[PDB]
């Protein structure tokens, strides 16, 4: 089910995306001293939920298709993360 | 006949916009609103707003040319 797919992708890709090189480069560039792995997971979960709610009708309740969108849009989504978007996912969505 | 005028009601954004903005102003003009002289002056002002020749003069000109 849609809820099942949403929970499974969050359970799966969170640790995969919490440790990618691009985000830890951008954190250094943006000097995010208060960033923690708990907030890292929350940012990844927000990303995944946003993709799911935007593209479930496009992909269906399919794990494989959503994974590839999560991989592709992840660099470009990271490029819009700045000092102002650490705590407001709404603003990051607006930028993205 | 001598002249045959064929008309197509084909659709186009620019032509339709021009036609609609002309028609709406025509319907604004034709709507109602020495007083005789003043009202004749206002009517001729509205005629000038849309035609280069006053229409009574045009009628007389046509009659004179035909005569």
């Amino acid at each position: 089910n849609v809820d099942e797919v949403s929970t499974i992708l969050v359970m799966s890709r969170c640790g995969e995306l919490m440790e990618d090189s691009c985000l830890r480069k951008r954190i250094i560039e943006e000097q995010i001293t208060d960033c923690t792995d708990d907030q890292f997971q929350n940012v990844a979960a927000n990303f995944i939920h946003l993709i799911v709610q935007a593209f479930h009708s496009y992909t269906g309740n399919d794990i494989f298709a959503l994974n590839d969108l999560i991989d592709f849009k992840w660099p470009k989504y990271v490029s819009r993360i700045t000092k102002e978007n650490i705590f407001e996912p709404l603003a990051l969505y607006k930028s993205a | 006949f001598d002249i045959l005028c064929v008309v197509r009601d084909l659709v186009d954004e620019e032509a339709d916009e021009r036609l609609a903005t002309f028609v709406v102003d025509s319907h604004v003009r034709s709507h109602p609103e020495n007083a005789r002289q003043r009202r004749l002056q206002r009517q001729r002002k509205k005629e000038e707003e849309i035609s280069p020749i006053p229409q009574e003069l045009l009628m007389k000109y046509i009659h004179y040319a035909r005569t």
Partner: protein, 96 residues
């Protein structure tokens, strides 16, 4: 009249003067004006004759003011008669 006649390019003013509230259709307005002014009924040597008036047919789709133009010729020409196709009879048009 002679003051008006000397204006350069008087023909365009006359053509633009026909039915001002009707937008466009300049190729029809010119024909209407030409039929209003008409030509010369040259009764050459008496024994031969040529009609002096121009006949105009307005053919087109509905919503093209093929009818309201006649409601300008009827109000502009010195003597105009208006009839509808099905509201006329052969006896009625010609002679009774």
């Amino acid at each position: 009249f002679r003051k008006i006649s000397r204006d350069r390019g008087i023909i365009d003013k006359i053509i633009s003067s026909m039915a001002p509230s009707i937008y466009g259709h300049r190729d029809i307005k010119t024909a209407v004006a030409c039929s209003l002014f008409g030509g010369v009924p040259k009764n050459v040597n008496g024994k031969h004759s040529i009609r002096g008036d121009i006949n105009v047919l307005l053919l087109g789709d509905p919503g093209t003011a093929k009818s309201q133009i006649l409601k300008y010729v009827e109000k502009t020409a010195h003597r105009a008669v208006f009839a509808t196709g099905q509201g006329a009879s052969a006896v009625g048009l010609t002679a009774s």
